[model samples]
Target: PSDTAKKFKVVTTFTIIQDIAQNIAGDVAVVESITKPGAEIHDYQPTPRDIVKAQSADLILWNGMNLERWFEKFFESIKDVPSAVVTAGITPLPIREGPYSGIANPHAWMSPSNALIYIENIRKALVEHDPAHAETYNRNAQAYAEKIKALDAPLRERLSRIPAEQRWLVTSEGAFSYLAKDYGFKEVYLWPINAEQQGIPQQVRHVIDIIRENKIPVVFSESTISDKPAKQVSKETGAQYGGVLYVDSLSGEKGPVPTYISLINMTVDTIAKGF
Candidate 1:
């Protein structure tokens, strides 16, 4: 490896975190995501290659919520590779209406309000792990965090414009749990979590009932997963399909949601437009 190849090895559990970590790391680290874009993070399993990558990394970043159910075991085998659980500082809400009800919802980053906390945690971890670049990391994280914080009020204000009784977000999976919590919207989904089964009959029936009962105009699914489930619900409930909302994975550089801020902005705008 060239001397340049040895630049601080910064690894994240997923793409969103990788983006945040890269924003803070600047030119100081080589940031990478363990799981590529579009991979199911609900219960993601790591391969031997992933372990080898982590073993070489100087630090790792991840969402602490029950998102990566397999991480505890994955961490046990890694030696001295430090990890920063980005969601640790945020007060995560429970997944209220799904198979995984009452447990932490891993999609906290979906809300920029919660993303500030993730940014701070990542900043602290980077500064601690690589003190030589402390000034750069601190400056970058502050700038990024402020951008995240600035969106909270506007997003809440815009999404709240819809009458409270009618302010509901229906999707294929309950991935928007945190966003709904922060933005004053009730969340209804076809499934609570993305598990082995998707778009199951009961799941479809449950959301269909909600849409029918409330007369919600539109329904959505995430970028990484299929909209077929929500499409089925939309078909039966007479709701317009709102297309895919960027959740687990961001889109390509030329796509609508190419960055963390773009992801949040695009998602909020889409939801408001649909409502």
Candidate 2:
């Protein structure tokens, strides 16, 4: 029989974190993301309804390395709710260009190694919030991590096939620092970060020069952002438009990346095939 008692409630800052949290939490908790599928996560604006829901959550999970700048004030009002930063304890790569350079890049989850840390952090948070289901959370976290490992091993090997000189990840925003570091791809993009200045003419021209100089074959954009800038770079440099990649957000149930694991695989597949 289904229990009438309410399950633990977990609220995350975005779809990616929510997917990871739900995987670990399993059926033990009710997990929800503040930002919906394909929403721009960098500067998400919370509504009155979001605040009200967050205030009532059993625990909050967020990717904390300056990723949720808008959540600062919203979180302030919900001081009583226990919260965990999934990116905590992971050594963050620095953003190397643009206005936000020298800060934690805030996209650590893109790396398979860093994602293990996020899973552990999420597990601990879930256990702390709902001790009764600690065993389930532990088991589920390990199981989910194995799935990530299985995919990550092959994905890494596949990406290694591209020659060194052509191993570049060009995109609309510099969201692939961690992933690029893992695969040894030199990262280039139209903009350094999102939710700020993006897709400017200067940005496009700069990437075009880099792509042409490096002989990079393909350029890509993300689901949450426009593809015009990347396409412009492609046209000017004679590089193929590599299609949109999924980062910072997942897509709807019927879309390509409904879960975090699918998101990772699809992104690597696109990049590997493109190169």
Local distance difference test, each candidate: 0.83, 0.88
* lDDT tens per residue, model 2, 1-275: 36797889999999999999899988888899999998898888889889988998999989999999888778987858988888879997888767778988898989988899999999988888788999999999999999888886789787888988778899888899999998888898877888667447887888888887878889999999999888888878879999789988999989989999889899999998897
Q: Against the true structure, what is each candidate's TM-score?
A: 0.91, 0.96
Error of model 1, residue 16, in angstroms: 0.8
- Which window of 10 residues has the lowest lDDT sum in candidate 2? 195-204
Give the TM-score (vs. native) of candidate 1.
0.91
lDDT by residue for model 1 (122-189), tens: 88898899999899999999988887788878877777779888989998778898888777788887
In angstroms, give how far residue 125 of model 1 lies from its true place.
0.7
Instruction: Report clash pairs, candidate 2.
Output: none
- Please report the TM-score between candidate 2 and the true structure: 0.96
List the pairs of residues colliding in candidate 1. Answer: none
